[PDB]
Design a protein around this ligand. Structure first.
Ligand SMILES: Nc1ncnc2c1ncn2[C@@H]1O[C@H](COP(=O)(O)OP(=O)(O)O)[C@@H](O)[C@H]1O
Ligand SMILES: [Mg+2]
Length: 374
């Protein structure tokens, strides 16, 4: 192309969003999975591919051992992370990472190794002209187009809360909760053994992930929901497995997401999503707090339960004083927020100087990022 518009990769733990820089929607939304087949291949018909990264794994999941390369925001296996990125440019976008500049997001307080290796790989593997690393929550604020607010983003394995006032991070106040979507999925598996459905296989876990999205919804009052669910069959809901069996679910649909509000359930002693937002406000200075309580942005995937926005409001309200009324942004496209906001930052002028360049890296090595990025 005459104009090369830098790639925005929002590499998360659960998915791998990507696209060109010119739009408010990615082109490339495929779950970050490498499938390895787990039997002898008897037929000599075709030489089947040894590995099945990307959406193909979701179709062939029956005979595969699906694995996740990124757990808790952190890249446990790179060989698998390289395979996902090769698929991202060559197959998903059909573009060259050398004839295009590129920006990769990352959750805060990740071990310094993560940033370092990302920098090496973007320069040594795909030989990128220029690269950058950004924090998720700062970009989610860009998307909502507000200079000041507190951003609470929960994805699949990391939940983080970052408070910004008049375009100034207070980084002493940035809290992070491990509890996230994967912990919610894995708790539904554990409470569907109640009604006697077992999901031991990797692929079985992915079927559970799809029930949670279809039926799980947060409740204003947990106790009142529980009483009604026990009293009557109104709540009960029924889903068709891939075999053609039916599973019926009742109270389990509003207990999958309740763990967020009381991690006592999952076994952790973390306070809540509501107490984490509150406490990040209350580490900030007195004057800044009034503007923050007013603006509270929900971002990401596990912010997409119905009920969630109405539960947060009520929750923080009780914690806060009678004045300083709290309003929660909870936008419609919050699922792709982080990426859309990454679209803008690259689009925005004066971000050019900030871009790390091969030239700089060649002198100071991968450790360049530890001084040129936040
Ligand atoms: N409609 C939905 N309702 C509830 N949770 C959802 C929904 N869609 C996806 N999820 C959750 O969102 C996570 C993926 O969202 P996202 O934040 O975009 O990904 P990542 O953490 O990889 O960036 C999954 O773990 C899943 O639990
Ligand atoms: Mg995310």
């Amino acid at each position: 192309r005459d104009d090369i518009a830098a790639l925005v990769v929002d590499n998360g733990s659960g998915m791998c969003k990507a696209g060109f820089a010119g739009d408010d929607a990615p082109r490339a939304v495929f779950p970050s999975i490498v499938g390895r087949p787990r039997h002898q291949g008897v037929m000599v018909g075709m030489g089947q591919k040894d590995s099945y990264v990307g959406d193909e794994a979701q179709s062939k999941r029956g005979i595969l051992t699906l694995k996740y390369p990124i757990e808790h925001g952190i890249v446990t296996n790179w060989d698998d992370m390289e395979k996902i990125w090769h698929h991202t440019f060559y197959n998903e976008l059909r573009v060259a990472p050398e004839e295009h500049p590129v920006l990769l997001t990352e959750a805060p307080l990740n071990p310094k190794a993560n940033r370092e290796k990302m920098t090496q790989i973007m320069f040594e593997t795909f030989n990128t002209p220029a690269m950058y690393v950004a924090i998720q929550a700062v970009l989610s604020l860009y998307a909502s187009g507000r200079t000041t607010g507190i951003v609470m983003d929960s994805g699949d394995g990391v939940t983080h809360t970052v408070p910004i006032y008049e375009g100034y991070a207070l980084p002493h106040a940035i809290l992070r909760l491990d509890l996230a979507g994967r912990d919610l999925t894995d708790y539904l598996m554990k409470i569907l053994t109640e009604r006697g459905y077992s999901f031991t296989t990797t692929a079985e876990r992915e079927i559970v992930r799809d029930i949670k999205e279809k039926l799980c919804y947060v409740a204003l009052d947990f106790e009142q929901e529980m009483a009604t669910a026990a009293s009557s069959s109104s709540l009960e809901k029924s889903y068709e497995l891939p075999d053609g069996q039916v599973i019926t679910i009742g109270n389990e649909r509003f207990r999958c997401p309740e763990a967020l509000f009381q991690p006592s359930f999952l076994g952790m002693e973390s306070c809540g999503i509501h107490e984490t937002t509150f406490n990040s406000i209350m580490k900030c200075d007195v004057d800044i707090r009034k503007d923050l309580y007013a603006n509270t942005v929900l971002s990401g995937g596990t912010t997409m339960y119905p009920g969630i926005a109405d539960r947060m409001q009520k929750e923080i309200t009780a914690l806060a004083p009678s004045t300083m009324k709290i309003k929660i942004i909870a936008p419609p496209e919050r699922k792709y927020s982080v990426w859309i906001g990454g679209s803008i930052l690259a689009s925005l002028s004066t971000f050019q100087q900030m871009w790390i360049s091969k030239q700089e890296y060649d002198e100071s090595g991968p450790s360049i990022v530890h001084r040129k990025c936040f």
